[PDB]
Amino acid sequence: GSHSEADNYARELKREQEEIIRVPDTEAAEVAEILARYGIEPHEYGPVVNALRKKPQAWLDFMMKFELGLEKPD
């Protein structure tokens, strides 16, 4: 009918947290790749990546926005 199953946001959010847990080193590389697109260098974004890694909740929301182009609702 009209849809009420856990939306693309709920699903992607599930996916993205499991990746962060299982292959953090791959998701770190994803952040480097995103920031490098804007001419930023490792010495500049190295500390940003390393900060996000220490903060699983922050990291999840960052990946939702910068990788998947999805905002946290409200």
Question: Burial letters for 13-50: b for 16+ Cβ neighbours within 10 Å, e otherwise?
Answer: beebbeebeeeeeebbebbeebbeeeeeeeeebeeebe
Looking at residue 38, the DSSP 8-state letter turns out to be T
Binding mask 4-23 for Zn ion (x = CB under 5 A): ------------x--x----
Nearer to Fe ion, 27 or 35 (CB): 27
Which position has the token pair 């946290």?
72
Among 4, 6, 38, 73, binds a copy of itself (CB under 8 A): 38
Residue 62 as a binder of a copy of itself (CB under 8 A): the answer is yes
Nearer to Zn ion, 19 or 61 (CB): 19
Q: How far is the CB of 55 from Fe ion (least distance, A)?
A: 15
